[PDB]
Amino acid sequence: GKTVMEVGGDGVAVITLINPPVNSLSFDVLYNLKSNYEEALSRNDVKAIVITGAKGRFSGGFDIEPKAGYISIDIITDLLEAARKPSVAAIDGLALGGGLELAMACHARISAPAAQLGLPELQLGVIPGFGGTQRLPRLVGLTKALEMILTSKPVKAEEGHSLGLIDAVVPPAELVTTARRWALDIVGRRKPWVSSVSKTDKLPPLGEAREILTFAKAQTLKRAPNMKHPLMCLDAIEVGIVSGPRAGLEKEAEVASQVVKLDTTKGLIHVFFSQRGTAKVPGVTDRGLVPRKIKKVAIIGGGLMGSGIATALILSNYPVILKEVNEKFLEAGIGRVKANLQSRVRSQEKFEKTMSLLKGSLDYESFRDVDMVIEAVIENISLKQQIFADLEKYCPQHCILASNTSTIDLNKIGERTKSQDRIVGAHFFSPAHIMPLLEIVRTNHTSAQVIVDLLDVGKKIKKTPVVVGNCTGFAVNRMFFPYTQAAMFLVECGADPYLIDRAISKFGMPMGPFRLCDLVGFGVAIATATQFIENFSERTYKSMIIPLMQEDKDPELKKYIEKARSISGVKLDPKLANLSEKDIIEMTFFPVVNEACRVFAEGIAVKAADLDIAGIMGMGFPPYRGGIMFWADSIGSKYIYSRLDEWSKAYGEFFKPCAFLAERGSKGVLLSAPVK
């Protein structure tokens, strides 16, 4: 990108940051800025400087330097902030990361009403590298700065104004005018000439600041023991407070140049891009098609999963209509919806107007206007086939015939119709309105235009869509089905279940295999596993543990579990008990890698990076580990292969490497590499 500078008749130089989409601070922009300043501070006709962004946006961050802190220190701190001419930032839209830092370097800040200000760097496993670790705590206080930097959450201009981050809030149309007026106020001493970096007004006493910093470090190691960058960022903050500002800067410059080398930040960076690339499906989204406008959606369900969908839809101003069989089931579903909205109330007129979008019905005549249908009925083929027969009958010819099915082949559902091009899989994960993932299941017949449509609806409802193929368990569930079975096989072999959970919950998972198995509900976990037992028998293990518990009907260990596993004694008891935490993880996750490769090779998933996001966003796989596939290559295919074969030749074909993994593992090549 670039920057344009123009000197008004009042002597104020206005510099516009120009680098779409969000005017990120590329080196290009920065060096143009440097030149701008060197000129402005040499021109006699220039009195002060104002900085603003193009197209109603200040700067969204860094683009996607000689020393370590050449910019932070030499350009931003010395050249700009320590200049003998005042700078004023004119903020509109957003000021995030480097964008917010550049603004903090200025001597005053004018902002438009609802602009966003924050330092999101930590979410990428990186740190503020332009002086944010210094100026933020000095402008808003240590307590707030710590919250913003650690939580990575942005703040609106209004709140920013009351914190001392923003000096004034004016309408977007007065932004630059106010700023240049402010700039000449400073030159004329009608207003203070403050340097943020050497401001102590807002800091706590040296001793208490250490108490606040110590505390933070402590609880950051309690929640996120896995990542180091936050603590590394807290270091830069403490140094700046104790040893002074200039020491703090160089400390940040050092921390920033080494934090990029961490293996977990490469993982976090990979997850960032992979999140974006899930909507790129070759042969579908490269055709020049454009999403259709869906103005009305029908949800045939009313049950738990159905009521969830409806919630997500109306929450995004989608007129939704539920159809049920009996009046009871209908009034029941509508009830769950309201309950879901009332929950997040504890606006009012908000969650009262969105209830008008939801309209009930026990008929099909109200489908003559629907642009998309989602069926969320019990997993009964006979019944689903019938629903799609009626759908094809009462619906418009363009209407999308989507199903939330989880265990039934999409091709069999549309058996009684001739609308195979309109039938697609819209797979949600309960709770439908919280789980961020959406599996768009395409068939051989699903038309590209329908996928492009759904792909767009997913984005509209704050979901992250992946386009997967039609097969047993699609991508997410099929991927992690070995997970639970590998665990239970280890248990039947003597392995302590609670050790398993602890080893894996510390690995990065939000839960343990068994711990999560209880949360999902034995009835559900066993119902979704059946699918794979019947389609991949020679690769699955039906542990009688759960069933035996079902027939007998703030959580802690159960002294009555030992007798339960013993009863399911079909296998013997090796030395799989007393395994290392590394081994537990390796025997529980490598089979998942193995399955991910089958999915990737079979073409079920478009690209490895999609599998990463899927496992991450569907099964809470550790983001800092990049994803199930990124992690697999992080260890090495040759290792995973060699280790997975040793088990195959010692426990059964369950651990046997699939052709794709084997062929690649031997050559020591990357697994995430495109299929050829």
Residue-by-residue DSSP string for 472-541: TTTTHHHHHHHHHHHHHHHHHTT--HHHHHHHHHHHT-SS-HHHHHHHH-HHHHHHHHHHHHHHSGGG--
Tokens of 197: 């970096």
What does DSSP assign to residue 71? I
Taking alpha carbons only, the member of 109, 156, 106, 149 closest to residue 128 is 149
Contact predicate 487/588, CB 8 Å? yes
**Active-site residue, selected from the candidate residues 101, 252, 392, 492:** 101
Resolution of the entry in angstroms: 2.5
Contact predicate 539/653, CB 8 Å? yes
Cα separation, 574 vs 76, whole angstroms: 64
Cα separation, 243 vs 50, whole angstroms: 32
**Active-site residue, selected from the candidate residues 121, 392, 439, 595:** 121
- The values of phi and psi at residue 332, to 5°, are -70, -50
205 cis-preceded (ω within 30 degrees of 0): no
Cα separation, 308 vs 306, whole angstroms: 5
Taking the CB of residue 130, how many other CB atoms lie within 10 A of it?
A: 31
Contact predicate 570/544, CB 8 Å? yes
Q: Sort strands 297-300 and 116-118 into parallel, antiparallel or unpaired.
A: unpaired
Strand, helix or coil for residue 445: coil
**CATH code at 474-667:** 1.10.1040.50
Integer angstrom CA distances of residue 131 from 61, 261, 366, 595:
13, 20, 59, 45
Taking alpha carbons only, the member of 8, 46, 16, 48 closest to residue 33 is 16
What does DSSP assign to residue 363? S
Strand, helix or coil for residue 43: coil
Cα separation, 176 vs 21, whole angstroms: 21
Q: Sort strands 372-375 and 358-361 into parallel, antiparallel or unpaired.
A: unpaired
Q: Active site includes 492?
A: no
Burial class (CB in 10 A: 0-12, 13-18, 19+), 364: middle
Rounded to a whole number of angstroms, the distance between the first and last alpha carbons of the chain is 37
Contact predicate 136/149, CB 8 Å? yes
Strand, helix or coil for residue 87: strand
- The residues facing 358 across adjacent strands are 320
What does DSSP assign to residue 59? B
Cα separation, 469 vs 443, whole angstroms: 6
Strand, helix or coil for residue 135: helix
Q: Which residue has the tokens 């050249």?
A: 79
Strand, helix or coil for residue 62: coil
Q: Which residue has the tokens 């090549």?
A: 669
Contact predicate 115/52, CB 8 Å? no
Contact predicate 131/76, CB 8 Å? yes
Contact predicate 133/240, CB 8 Å? yes
- The values of phi and psi at residue 567, to 5°, are -60, -35
Distance of CA 313 to the CA centre of its chain: 20
Cα angle at 432 between 441 and 627, to 5 degrees? 65
Cβ partners under 8 Å of residue 188, min gap 6: none
Taking alpha carbons only, the member of 450, 472, 507, 508 closest to residue 595 is 472
21 cis-preceded (ω within 30 degrees of 0): yes
Contact predicate 17/54, CB 8 Å? yes
The alpha helices in 539-602, defined as continuous H runs, are 545-550, 562-567, 581-601
Contact predicate 203/209, CB 8 Å? yes
The helix (run of H) or strand (run of E) holding residue 259 is helix 245-259
Q: Active site includes 101?
A: yes
Q: Which residue has the tokens 């794709």?
A: 660
CB burial of 189-212 (b: ≥16 within 10 Å; e: otherwise) equals: eebeeeebbebeebbbeeeebeeb
Taking alpha carbons only, the member of 643, 538, 646 closest to residue 598 is 538
Residue positions counted in the chain? 676
Cα separation, 40 vs 49, whole angstroms: 8
- The residues facing 90 across adjacent strands are 52, 110
- The sign of the CA dihedral 125, 129, 134, 140 is negative
Q: Sort strands 2-7 and 12-18 into parallel, antiparallel or unpaired.
A: antiparallel
Cα separation, 570 vs 492, whole angstroms: 8
Contact predicate 307/336, CB 8 Å? yes
Taking alpha carbons only, the member of 134, 147, 121, 133 closest to residue 62 is 121
- The values of phi and psi at residue 442, to 5°, are -95, 155
What does DSSP assign to residue 10? T
- The residues facing 440 across adjacent strands are 426, 467
Taking alpha carbons only, the member of 217, 152, 269 closest to residue 625 is 269
Cα separation, 147 vs 234, whole angstroms: 12
Q: Which CATH architecture has domain 294-473?
A: 3-Layer(aba) Sandwich (3.40)
Domain limits, the chain: 1-293, 294-473, 474-667
Cα separation, 264 vs 472, whole angstroms: 32
What would you report as the CA-atom Rg of the chain, rounded to the nearest whole angstrom?
Answer: 29
Cα separation, 471 vs 465, whole angstroms: 17
**CATH code at 1-293:** 3.90.226.10
Q: Using N-to-C axis directions, what is the helix angle for 628-635 and 637-651, rounded to 10°?
A: 90
- The values of phi and psi at residue 283, to 5°, are 75, 5
Cα separation, 612 vs 464, whole angstroms: 12
- The residues facing 136 across adjacent strands are none
